[PDB]
Structure 1
Amino acid sequence: VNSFSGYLKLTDNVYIKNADIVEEAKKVKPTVVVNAANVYLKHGGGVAGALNKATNNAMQVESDDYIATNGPLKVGGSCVLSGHNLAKHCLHVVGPNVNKGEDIQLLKSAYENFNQHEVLLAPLLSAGIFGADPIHSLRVCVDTVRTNVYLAVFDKNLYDKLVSSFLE
């Protein structure tokens, strides 16, 4: 039903809110929820762990069956799988993990996957323990994504820093 509320409008297609992506999925019932995935789809911690736990492990079971038959994704790539109880679909996107030495230029390719969907609920790619500069990730999102993207950032200080930096 894509009923998003309480978002700040940054540009004509990019919105942001201080919220847990899981709670937004439950309230919004979006067509697509983006997962900040890794190449073998191991959803242990962070955003991926929160989304998986909210599906009572159904996401990990489905992802293990996908990997068994298809092998790992590439950095910058994506995979559409079921969204289970959280959304119609889950778009698993692999952004670069710069804390593990992966190339930050691939963050543009990671965001380009969003353009295949008219509207998406998403986290800020490569932020948190992946180590990319969050202000840079927001700039790449704004410059690359043309479809409607609703970013949920679950940290008040980071959300406030992003909004202030964007409005500079």
Structure 2
Amino acid sequence: SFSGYLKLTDNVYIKNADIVEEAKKVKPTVVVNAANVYLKHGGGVAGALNKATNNAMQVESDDYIATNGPLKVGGSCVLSGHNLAKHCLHVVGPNVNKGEDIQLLKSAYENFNQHEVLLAPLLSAGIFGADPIHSLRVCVDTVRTNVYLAVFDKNLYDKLVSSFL
């Protein structure tokens, strides 16, 4: 069971935590990856999750792309969670540093509704360049299933909580 989360709404919870450490402790049914369309898990959340799998996530992902081609921005795929979770839901939020449409963030969060409970980061935050405050608002207004958000940066976590409405 998830522990130490602050309840923001009926279905959204948040914690200042490293999502890799959280996944290793909880072993959730679903961990969300902040993926790109190519499933190239180089940095940010994706790089960290992939490193924690000893690159097994990347190997699996490369086979997935070779068979299926790239994901769409706003889309997702379900792959193995390896040693971190039962499944990994790879979700592609828009990357503002690539000029992608921030309106696709809502479509990205809609993928979460296909899973009753998820451990997730804020989509499009961090190296994806979107405002994490906006990402949290889109999350709360889009996701209806139970989502446990892990925010690594304590300063950002405090800002997210203190500005939540």
**TM-score bucket (shorter structure):** over 0.9
Q: Secondary structure at the match of 1:166?
A: coil
- CA distance in structure 1 between the aligned counterparts of 2:11 and 2:71, rounded to whole angstroms: 28
CA displacement 1:25-71 (0-9 Å, x = unmatched) = 01111000000000000001110010001111100000000001110
The Cα offsets for residues 128-162 of structure 1, whole Å up to 9 and x where unpaired, read as: 11111111100000000000000000000000000
TM-score (norm 2): 0.99
Partner of 2:109: helix, strand, or coil?
A: helix
Runs of 4+ off more than 4 Å: none
Aligned length: 165
In the alignment, the residues of structure 1 paired with residue 139 and residue 162 of structure 2 have an alpha-carbon distance, to the nearest angstrom, of: 16
Distance, in Å, in 1 between the alignment partners of 2:32 and 2:110 is 13
**CA positional deviation for 1:99:** 1.5
User: How far did residue 109 of structure 1 move?
Assistant: 0.2
SS in 2 for 1:12: coil
Give unmatched runs, 5+ long, in structure 2: none
Q: Partner of 1:87 in structure 2?
A: 85
Cα deviation code 1:70-116 (max 9, x no counterpart): 10000000000000110000000000001110000000000000000
What is the Cα-based RMSD across aligned positions, in Å? Answer: 0.6
Please give the alpha-carbon distance, in whole angstroms, between the structure 2 residues aligned to 1:49 and 1:98. 18
Which whole-Å CA distance do the structure 1 matches of 2:84 and 2:52 have between them?
8
TM-score of the two chains, using structure 1 as the length reference: 0.97
Q: What is the aligned-residue identity percentage?
A: 100
In 2, distance between residues paired with 1:56 and 1:150? 24
